[PDB]
Amino acid sequence: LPVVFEDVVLHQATILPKTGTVSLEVRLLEASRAFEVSENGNLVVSGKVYQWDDPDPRLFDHPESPT
Amino acid sequence: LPVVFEDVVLHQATILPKTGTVSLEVRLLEASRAFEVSENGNLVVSGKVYQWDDPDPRLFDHPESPT
């Protein structure tokens, strides 16, 4: 599955405890091509995710070097 | 439930069929306080909806008419 993200925003940084676990929930809105990651109801990440219909290997040709 | 809708956008009109039924699906993202209404996989209504924490009657006092 080739995927394209857009307008990703990171709202808060989740910290991994030395003991226990953190539950992250992921909800997709397929119609609007949007997603949302949450932890205990507090938004952590937001943006747009959808499938790349027609890949172009040209996009991965290396850019003109700065130097 | 006193509620608040915000930044609502209607993207297309659903035509109610004379015979049959049309099924609308509504999904909520509580953390983002956003909602989407899709019709067979096509976005219809998008915006934000959330509970009104502190209702206040003053907001409904009738504005003095300019005329």
GROMACS .gro file of N, CA and C in nm:
model
  402
    1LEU      N    1   0.083  -0.121   0.000
    1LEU     CA    2   0.000   0.000   0.000
    1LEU      C    3   0.086   0.125   0.000
    2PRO      N    4   0.104   0.192  -0.114
    2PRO     CA    5   0.170   0.323  -0.112
    2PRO      C    6   0.077   0.429  -0.058
    3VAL      N    7   0.126   0.507   0.039
    3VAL     CA    8   0.044   0.600   0.114
    3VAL      C    9   0.103   0.740   0.102
    4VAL      N   10   0.015   0.840   0.103
    4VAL     CA   11   0.054   0.980   0.100
    4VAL      C   12  -0.010   1.050   0.220
    5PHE      N   13   0.071   1.122   0.296
    5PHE     CA   14   0.023   1.205   0.405
    5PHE      C   15   0.023   1.351   0.363
    6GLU      N   16  -0.062   1.431   0.427
    6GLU     CA   17  -0.066   1.574   0.402
    6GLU      C   18  -0.106   1.647   0.529
    7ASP      N   19  -0.043   1.762   0.552
    7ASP     CA   20  -0.080   1.851   0.661
    7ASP      C   21  -0.079   1.779   0.796
    8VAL      N   22   0.020   1.692   0.816
    8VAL     CA   23   0.035   1.627   0.945
    8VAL      C   24   0.073   1.730   1.050
    9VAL      N   25   0.008   1.722   1.166
    9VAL     CA   26   0.036   1.810   1.279
    9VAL      C   27   0.053   1.723   1.402
   10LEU      N   28   0.156   1.751   1.481
   10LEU     CA   29   0.181   1.681   1.607
   10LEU      C   30   0.151   1.777   1.721
   11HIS      N   31   0.051   1.743   1.802
   11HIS     CA   32   0.001   1.835   1.904
   11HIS      C   33   0.073   1.819   2.037
   12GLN      N   34   0.087   1.697   2.087
   12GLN     CA   35   0.161   1.673   2.210
   12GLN      C   36   0.246   1.549   2.192
   13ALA      N   37   0.354   1.542   2.270
   13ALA     CA   38   0.447   1.430   2.265
   13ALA      C   39   0.411   1.330   2.373
   14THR      N   40   0.384   1.207   2.333
   14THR     CA   41   0.353   1.101   2.428
   14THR      C   42   0.482   1.038   2.479
   15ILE      N   43   0.485   1.009   2.608
   15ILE     CA   44   0.605   0.961   2.676
   15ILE      C   45   0.582   0.816   2.715
   16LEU      N   46   0.679   0.731   2.685
   16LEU     CA   47   0.666   0.589   2.712
   16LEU      C   48   0.716   0.557   2.852
   17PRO      N   49   0.632   0.509   2.942
   17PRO     CA   50   0.679   0.480   3.078
   17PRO      C   51   0.768   0.357   3.081
   18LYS      N   52   0.862   0.358   3.177
   18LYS     CA   53   0.949   0.242   3.194
   18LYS      C   54   0.869   0.116   3.225
   19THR      N   55   0.753   0.131   3.288
   19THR     CA   56   0.666   0.020   3.322
   19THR      C   57   0.524   0.053   3.279
   20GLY      N   58   0.452  -0.049   3.234
   20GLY     CA   59   0.318  -0.030   3.183
   20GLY      C   60   0.317  -0.006   3.033
   21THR      N   61   0.202   0.043   2.986
   21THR     CA   62   0.183   0.065   2.843
   21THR      C   63   0.094   0.187   2.823
   22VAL      N   64   0.098   0.240   2.701
   22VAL     CA   65   0.014   0.352   2.661
   22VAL      C   66  -0.072   0.307   2.544
   23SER      N   67  -0.202   0.329   2.554
   23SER     CA   68  -0.296   0.289   2.449
   23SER      C   69  -0.320   0.407   2.356
   24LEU      N   70  -0.286   0.390   2.229
   24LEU     CA   71  -0.308   0.490   2.126
   24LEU      C   72  -0.419   0.443   2.034
   25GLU      N   73  -0.518   0.529   2.012
   25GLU     CA   74  -0.634   0.498   1.929
   25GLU      C   75  -0.623   0.573   1.797
   26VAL      N   76  -0.664   0.508   1.689
   26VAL     CA   77  -0.654   0.562   1.554
   26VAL      C   78  -0.790   0.554   1.488
   27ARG      N   79  -0.839   0.668   1.438
   27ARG     CA   80  -0.967   0.675   1.370
   27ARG      C   81  -0.947   0.740   1.234
   28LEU      N   82  -1.001   0.678   1.130
   28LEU     CA   83  -0.992   0.730   0.994
   28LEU      C   84  -1.129   0.775   0.946
   29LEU      N   85  -1.132   0.886   0.873
   29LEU     CA   86  -1.251   0.933   0.803
   29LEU      C   87  -1.224   0.916   0.654
   30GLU      N   88  -1.266   0.802   0.600
   30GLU     CA   89  -1.232   0.769   0.462
   30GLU      C   90  -1.289   0.871   0.364
   31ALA      N   91  -1.410   0.920   0.391
   31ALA     CA   92  -1.473   1.014   0.298
   31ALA      C   93  -1.391   1.141   0.285
   32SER      N   94  -1.342   1.194   0.397
   32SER     CA   95  -1.266   1.318   0.398
   32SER      C   96  -1.115   1.296   0.391
   33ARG      N   97  -1.069   1.171   0.388
   33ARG     CA   98  -0.926   1.141   0.382
   33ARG      C   99  -0.852   1.207   0.498
   34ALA      N  100  -0.906   1.190   0.619
   34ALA     CA  101  -0.847   1.248   0.739
   34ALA      C  102  -0.837   1.140   0.846
   35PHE      N  103  -0.742   1.159   0.938
   35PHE     CA  104  -0.721   1.066   1.047
   35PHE      C  105  -0.701   1.143   1.177
   36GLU      N  106  -0.691   1.068   1.286
   36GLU     CA  107  -0.675   1.129   1.418
   36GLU      C  108  -0.624   1.023   1.514
   37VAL      N  109  -0.508   1.047   1.574
   37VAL     CA  110  -0.453   0.961   1.678
   37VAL      C  111  -0.478   1.029   1.811
   38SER      N  112  -0.526   0.952   1.909
   38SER     CA  113  -0.562   1.007   2.038
   38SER      C  114  -0.510   0.917   2.150
   39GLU      N  115  -0.490   0.978   2.266
   39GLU     CA  116  -0.450   0.906   2.387
   39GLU      C  117  -0.531   0.961   2.503
   40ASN      N  118  -0.617   0.877   2.560
   40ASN     CA  119  -0.705   0.919   2.669
   40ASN      C  120  -0.791   1.039   2.627
   41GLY      N  121  -0.830   1.043   2.500
   41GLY     CA  122  -0.916   1.148   2.450
   41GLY      C  123  -0.846   1.279   2.418
   42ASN      N  124  -0.714   1.286   2.435
   42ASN     CA  125  -0.638   1.407   2.405
   42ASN      C  126  -0.571   1.390   2.269
   43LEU      N  127  -0.603   1.480   2.176
   43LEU     CA  128  -0.548   1.471   2.042
   43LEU      C  129  -0.396   1.478   2.047
   44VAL      N  130  -0.331   1.384   1.978
   44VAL     CA  131  -0.186   1.379   1.971
   44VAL      C  132  -0.135   1.404   1.829
   45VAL      N  133  -0.207   1.355   1.728
   45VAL     CA  134  -0.168   1.375   1.589
   45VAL      C  135  -0.293   1.392   1.504
   46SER      N  136  -0.279   1.468   1.396
   46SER     CA  137  -0.389   1.495   1.305
   46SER      C  138  -0.333   1.518   1.166
   47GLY      N  139  -0.418   1.502   1.066
   47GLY     CA  140  -0.375   1.526   0.929
   47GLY      C  141  -0.462   1.450   0.831
   48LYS      N  142  -0.405   1.428   0.712
   48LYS     CA  143  -0.473   1.361   0.602
   48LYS      C  144  -0.389   1.243   0.556
   49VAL      N  145  -0.454   1.128   0.539
   49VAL     CA  146  -0.390   1.007   0.489
   49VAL      C  147  -0.480   0.944   0.384
   50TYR      N  148  -0.420   0.897   0.275
   50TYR     CA  149  -0.496   0.833   0.169
   50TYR      C  150  -0.401   0.751   0.083
   51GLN      N  151  -0.459   0.668  -0.003
   51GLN     CA  152  -0.381   0.578  -0.086
   51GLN      C  153  -0.329   0.651  -0.210
   52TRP      N  154  -0.205   0.621  -0.247
   52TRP     CA  155  -0.143   0.680  -0.365
   52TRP      C  156  -0.187   0.600  -0.487
   53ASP      N  157  -0.275   0.659  -0.568
   53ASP     CA  158  -0.337   0.584  -0.677
   53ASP      C  159  -0.235   0.545  -0.783
   54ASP      N  160  -0.158   0.642  -0.832
   54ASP     CA  161  -0.066   0.621  -0.944
   54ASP      C  162   0.074   0.663  -0.903
   55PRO      N  163   0.155   0.571  -0.852
   55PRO     CA  164   0.291   0.607  -0.811
   55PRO      C  165   0.375   0.656  -0.928
   56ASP      N  166   0.473   0.740  -0.896
   56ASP     CA  167   0.568   0.792  -0.995
   56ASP      C  168   0.709   0.774  -0.941
   57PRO      N  169   0.785   0.675  -0.989
   57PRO     CA  170   0.925   0.663  -0.944
   57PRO      C  171   1.009   0.785  -0.975
   58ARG      N  172   0.965   0.873  -1.065
   58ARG     CA  173   1.039   0.996  -1.090
   58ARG      C  174   1.050   1.081  -0.965
   59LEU      N  175   0.950   1.074  -0.877
   59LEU     CA  176   0.953   1.156  -0.756
   59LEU      C  177   1.072   1.121  -0.668
   60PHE      N  178   1.123   0.999  -0.677
   60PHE     CA  179   1.232   0.953  -0.592
   60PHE      C  180   1.368   0.966  -0.657
   61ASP      N  181   1.377   1.029  -0.774
   61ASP     CA  182   1.507   1.064  -0.829
   61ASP      C  183   1.571   1.173  -0.744
   62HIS      N  184   1.700   1.159  -0.718
   62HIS     CA  185   1.765   1.243  -0.618
   62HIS      C  186   1.773   1.387  -0.667
   63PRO      N  187   1.745   1.484  -0.580
   63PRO     CA  188   1.740   1.624  -0.625
   63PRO      C  189   1.878   1.679  -0.655
   64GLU      N  190   1.878   1.792  -0.727
   64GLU     CA  191   2.002   1.862  -0.754
   64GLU      C  192   2.068   1.901  -0.622
   65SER      N  193   2.192   1.858  -0.604
   65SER     CA  194   2.258   1.874  -0.475
   65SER      C  195   2.276   2.022  -0.442
   66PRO      N  196   2.258   2.062  -0.316
   66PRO     CA  197   2.283   2.203  -0.281
   66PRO      C  198   2.424   2.248  -0.314
   67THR      N  199   2.523   2.162  -0.292
   67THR     CA  200   2.662   2.190  -0.326
   67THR      C  201   2.708   2.091  -0.432
   68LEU      N  202  -2.934   1.780   2.589
   68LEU     CA  203  -2.800   1.809   2.538
   68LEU      C  204  -2.797   1.941   2.462
   69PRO      N  205  -2.758   2.052   2.524
   69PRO     CA  206  -2.729   2.173   2.446
   69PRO      C  207  -2.599   2.156   2.368
   70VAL      N  208  -2.605   2.185   2.238
   70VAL     CA  209  -2.497   2.152   2.146
   70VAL      C  210  -2.457   2.277   2.069
   71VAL      N  211  -2.337   2.272   2.012
   71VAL     CA  212  -2.282   2.381   1.932
   71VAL      C  213  -2.225   2.322   1.804
   72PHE      N  214  -2.274   2.369   1.690
   72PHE     CA  215  -2.217   2.335   1.560
   72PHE      C  216  -2.133   2.452   1.511
   73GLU      N  217  -2.024   2.420   1.442
   73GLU     CA  218  -1.928   2.523   1.404
   73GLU      C  219  -1.863   2.485   1.271
   74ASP      N  220  -1.850   2.584   1.183
   74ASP     CA  221  -1.782   2.567   1.055
   74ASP      C  222  -1.843   2.453   0.974
   75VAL      N  223  -1.976   2.449   0.968
   75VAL     CA  224  -2.044   2.347   0.890
   75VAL      C  225  -2.033   2.379   0.742
   76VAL      N  226  -2.012   2.276   0.660
   76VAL     CA  227  -2.005   2.289   0.515
   76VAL      C  228  -2.086   2.177   0.453
   77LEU      N  229  -2.179   2.213   0.365
   77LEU     CA  230  -2.258   2.116   0.290
   77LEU      C  231  -2.200   2.104   0.150
   78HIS      N  232  -2.149   1.985   0.117
   78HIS     CA  233  -2.076   1.965  -0.008
   78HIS      C  234  -2.163   1.917  -0.123
   79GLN      N  235  -2.270   1.843  -0.095
   79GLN     CA  236  -2.360   1.800  -0.200
   79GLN      C  237  -2.498   1.777  -0.140
   80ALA      N  238  -2.599   1.778  -0.226
   80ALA     CA  239  -2.737   1.761  -0.185
   80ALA      C  240  -2.780   1.617  -0.208
   81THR      N  241  -2.842   1.557  -0.107
   81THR     CA  242  -2.897   1.423  -0.119
   81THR      C  243  -3.043   1.432  -0.163
   82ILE      N  244  -3.075   1.364  -0.272
   82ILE     CA  245  -3.211   1.362  -0.326
   82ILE      C  246  -3.283   1.242  -0.266
   83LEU      N  247  -3.390   1.268  -0.193
   83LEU     CA  248  -3.466   1.159  -0.132
   83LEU      C  249  -3.543   1.084  -0.240
   84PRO      N  250  -3.520   0.955  -0.260
   84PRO     CA  251  -3.587   0.885  -0.370
   84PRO      C  252  -3.735   0.869  -0.343
   85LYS      N  253  -3.813   0.865  -0.451
   85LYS     CA  254  -3.956   0.841  -0.438
   85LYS      C  255  -3.983   0.701  -0.385
   86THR      N  256  -3.912   0.601  -0.438
   86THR     CA  257  -3.921   0.464  -0.391
   86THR      C  258  -3.783   0.417  -0.351
   87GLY      N  259  -3.772   0.358  -0.232
   87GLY     CA  260  -3.646   0.316  -0.177
   87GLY      C  261  -3.605   0.400  -0.058
   88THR      N  262  -3.477   0.388  -0.022
   88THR     CA  263  -3.422   0.462   0.090
   88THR      C  264  -3.278   0.500   0.059
   89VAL      N  265  -3.232   0.606   0.125
   89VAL     CA  266  -3.095   0.654   0.115
   89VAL      C  267  -3.036   0.656   0.255
   90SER      N  268  -2.919   0.596   0.271
   90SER     CA  269  -2.860   0.571   0.402
   90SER      C  270  -2.744   0.666   0.426
   91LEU      N  271  -2.754   0.747   0.531
   91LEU     CA  272  -2.652   0.843   0.568
   91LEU      C  273  -2.577   0.792   0.690
   92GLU      N  274  -2.444   0.801   0.686
   92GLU     CA  275  -2.358   0.757   0.795
   92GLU      C  276  -2.286   0.877   0.853
   93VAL      N  277  -2.291   0.891   0.986
   93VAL     CA  278  -2.231   1.003   1.057
   93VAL      C  279  -2.125   0.949   1.151
   94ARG      N  280  -2.004   1.003   1.140
   94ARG     CA  281  -1.891   0.964   1.224
   94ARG      C  282  -1.841   1.086   1.300
   95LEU      N  283  -1.798   1.065   1.424
   95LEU     CA  284  -1.749   1.171   1.510
   95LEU      C  285  -1.606   1.144   1.551
   96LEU      N  286  -1.529   1.251   1.565
   96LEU     CA  287  -1.394   1.248   1.622
   96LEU      C  288  -1.397   1.337   1.745
   97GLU      N  289  -1.418   1.277   1.862
   97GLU     CA  290  -1.439   1.356   1.983
   97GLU      C  291  -1.317   1.443   2.014
   98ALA      N  292  -1.197   1.387   2.003
   98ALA     CA  293  -1.078   1.463   2.038
   98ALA      C  294  -1.062   1.584   1.948
   99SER      N  295  -1.085   1.567   1.818
   99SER     CA  296  -1.082   1.679   1.725
   99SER      C  297  -1.211   1.760   1.726
  100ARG      N  298  -1.317   1.708   1.788
  100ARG     CA  299  -1.447   1.774   1.788
  100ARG      C  300  -1.490   1.806   1.645
  101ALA      N  301  -1.484   1.704   1.559
  101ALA     CA  302  -1.524   1.715   1.420
  101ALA      C  303  -1.620   1.601   1.386
  102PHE      N  304  -1.699   1.623   1.281
  102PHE     CA  305  -1.795   1.523   1.236
  102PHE      C  306  -1.800   1.523   1.085
  103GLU      N  307  -1.845   1.410   1.030
  103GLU     CA  308  -1.861   1.393   0.886
  103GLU      C  309  -1.986   1.311   0.860
  104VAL      N  310  -2.061   1.350   0.757
  104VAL     CA  311  -2.177   1.275   0.710
  104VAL      C  312  -2.149   1.232   0.567
  105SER      N  313  -2.149   1.101   0.544
  105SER     CA  314  -2.117   1.044   0.414
  105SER      C  315  -2.237   0.970   0.359
  106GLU      N  316  -2.252   0.973   0.226
  106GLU     CA  317  -2.362   0.907   0.156
  106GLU      C  318  -2.302   0.813   0.053
  107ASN      N  319  -2.300   0.684   0.084
  107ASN     CA  320  -2.244   0.582  -0.004
  107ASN      C  321  -2.096   0.605  -0.030
  108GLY      N  322  -2.028   0.670   0.064
  108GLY     CA  323  -1.886   0.697   0.051
  108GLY      C  324  -1.851   0.833  -0.005
  109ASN      N  325  -1.947   0.923  -0.018
  109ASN     CA  326  -1.922   1.059  -0.065
  109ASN      C  327  -1.951   1.157   0.047
  110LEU      N  328  -1.858   1.248   0.072
  110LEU     CA  329  -1.875   1.346   0.178
  110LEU      C  330  -1.995   1.436   0.150
  111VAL      N  331  -2.077   1.458   0.253
  111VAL     CA  332  -2.195   1.542   0.239
  111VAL      C  333  -2.181   1.666   0.327
  112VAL      N  334  -2.170   1.646   0.458
  112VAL     CA  335  -2.160   1.756   0.554
  112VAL      C  336  -2.036   1.736   0.638
  113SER      N  337  -1.960   1.844   0.656
  113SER     CA  338  -1.839   1.842   0.738
  113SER      C  339  -1.836   1.966   0.826
  114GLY      N  340  -1.775   1.952   0.943
  114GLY     CA  341  -1.769   2.062   1.038
  114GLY      C  342  -1.734   2.011   1.176
  115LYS      N  343  -1.768   2.091   1.276
  115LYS     CA  344  -1.740   2.061   1.416
  115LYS      C  345  -1.868   2.067   1.498
  116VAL      N  346  -1.883   1.971   1.589
  116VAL     CA  347  -1.996   1.966   1.681
  116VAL      C  348  -1.944   1.924   1.818
  117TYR      N  349  -1.988   1.994   1.922
  117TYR     CA  350  -1.945   1.961   2.057
  117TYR      C  351  -2.050   2.009   2.156
  118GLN      N  352  -2.049   1.947   2.274
  118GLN     CA  353  -2.144   1.982   2.378
  118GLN      C  354  -2.116   2.122   2.431
  119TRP      N  355  -2.223   2.194   2.463
  119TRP     CA  356  -2.212   2.331   2.514
  119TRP      C  357  -2.196   2.323   2.665
  120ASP      N  358  -2.076   2.352   2.714
  120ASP     CA  359  -2.047   2.332   2.855
  120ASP      C  360  -2.140   2.415   2.943
  121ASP      N  361  -2.149   2.546   2.917
  121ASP     CA  362  -2.219   2.640   3.003
  121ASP      C  363  -2.322   2.717   2.922
  122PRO      N  364  -2.443   2.663   2.907
  122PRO     CA  365  -2.549   2.740   2.841
  122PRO      C  366  -2.578   2.870   2.916
  123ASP      N  367  -2.610   2.974   2.839
  123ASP     CA  368  -2.643   3.104   2.897
  123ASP      C  369  -2.763   3.165   2.826
  124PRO      N  370  -2.873   3.191   2.896
  124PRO     CA  371  -2.993   3.242   2.827
  124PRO      C  372  -2.971   3.375   2.756
  125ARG      N  373  -2.879   3.459   2.805
  125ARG     CA  374  -2.864   3.592   2.747
  125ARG      C  375  -2.838   3.587   2.598
  126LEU      N  376  -2.775   3.480   2.549
  126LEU     CA  377  -2.741   3.472   2.408
  126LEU      C  378  -2.863   3.476   2.318
  127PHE      N  379  -2.982   3.447   2.372
  127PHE     CA  380  -3.104   3.440   2.293
  127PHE      C  381  -3.194   3.560   2.312
  128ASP      N  382  -3.148   3.665   2.379
  128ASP     CA  383  -3.226   3.788   2.387
  128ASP      C  384  -3.234   3.853   2.250
  129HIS      N  385  -3.352   3.903   2.216
  129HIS     CA  386  -3.378   3.946   2.079
  129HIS      C  387  -3.301   4.074   2.047
  130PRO      N  388  -3.213   4.074   1.947
  130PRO     CA  389  -3.143   4.198   1.912
  130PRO      C  390  -3.240   4.308   1.873
  131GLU      N  391  -3.212   4.429   1.920
  131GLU     CA  392  -3.292   4.545   1.882
  131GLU      C  393  -3.289   4.563   1.731
  132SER      N  394  -3.407   4.579   1.672
  132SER     CA  395  -3.416   4.587   1.527
  132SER      C  396  -3.359   4.719   1.477
  133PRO      N  397  -3.278   4.718   1.370
  133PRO     CA  398  -3.227   4.845   1.316
  133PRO      C  399  -3.337   4.937   1.266
  134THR      N  400  -3.452   4.884   1.227
  134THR     CA  401  -3.564   4.964   1.178
  134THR      C  402  -3.674   4.966   1.284
   0.00000   0.00000   0.00000
